[PDB]
């Protein structure tokens, strides 16, 4: 059973105009099997539009490619991003954590998606009581992109609602 193709794609921006289907493929095949690899071009001039996409056989291969950033492809540092589900942010809202979820619950779970820089457990401005949601800020957007395409997040026994924040 193959993961949906949308979740196996990487959009690559900032290409050198000299990058070709073949040179993009040779580069990104270092991190997995590519079922598709396309440089986008003008339909009339054939001049590169400066971006393209690669499709891996598995999500773990996408992860490997993202973990190998920065990618310098044909002399230029490119910008890979997972396909849209792009709203490129480093912060998530985590809701449904109730009053008993602490910083270490959130850290122990989310640190396996990426490097955490800030955890903000929200409290009532008047009483100081926990409001039941939090924000987590990572050092990079791919953490967030992995998180929000999951159907489920279980933290401290709570089924949480997680979305991109600002
Ligand atoms: C769309 N499904 C979710 C709802 O926000 C997103 C990931 O976190 C919880 C499940």
Instruction: For tokens 């997972």, name the residue.
Output: 82
How many angstroms does the Cα of residue 151 sit away from the middle of ligand 1? 5
What residues have CB less than 8 Å from 8, skipping those under 6 apart? 35, 55, 56, 57, 58, 59, 61, 62
Contacts of 19-23 with C-beta under 8 Å, sequence gap 24+, read 19/48, 19/52, 19/73, 19/74, 19/76, 21/52, 23/73, 23/74
Specify which residues 9 forms β-bridges with.
Answer: 55
Method of determination? X-ray
Domains in the chain, please, with CATH? 5-82 (3.30.70.330), 91-164 (3.30.70.330)
Specify which residues 10 forms β-bridges with.
Answer: 54, 82
How many angstroms does the Cα of residue 110 sit away from the middle of ligand 1? 14
Specify which residues 36 forms β-bridges with.
Answer: 55
CB distance 163 to ligand 1 below 6 Å: yes
How many angstroms does the Cα of residue 20 sit away from the middle of ligand 1? 37
């Amino acid at each position: 059973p193959k993961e949906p193709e949308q979740l196996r794609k990487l959009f690559i921006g900032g290409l050198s105009f000299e990058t070709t289907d073949e040179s993009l493929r040779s580069h990104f095949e270092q991190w997995g099997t590519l079922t598709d690899c396309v440089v986008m071009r003008d339909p009339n001039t054939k001049r590169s539009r400066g971006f393209g996409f690669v499709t891996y056989a598995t999500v773990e291969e996408v992860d490997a490619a993202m973990n190998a950033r920065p990618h310098k492809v044909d002399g230029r540092v490119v910008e890979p991003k997972r396909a849209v589900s792009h709203l490129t942010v480093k912060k998530i809202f985590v809701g449904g954590i109730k009053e008993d979820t602490e910083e270490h619950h959130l850290r122990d779970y989310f640190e396996q998606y990426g490097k955490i820089e800030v955890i903000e457990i929200m409290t009532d401005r008047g009483s100081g009581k926990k409001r039941g949601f939090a924000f987590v800020t990572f050092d990079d957007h791919d953490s967030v992109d992995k998180i929000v395409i999951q159907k489920y997040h279980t933290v401290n026994g709570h089924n949480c609602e997680v979305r991109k924040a600002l």
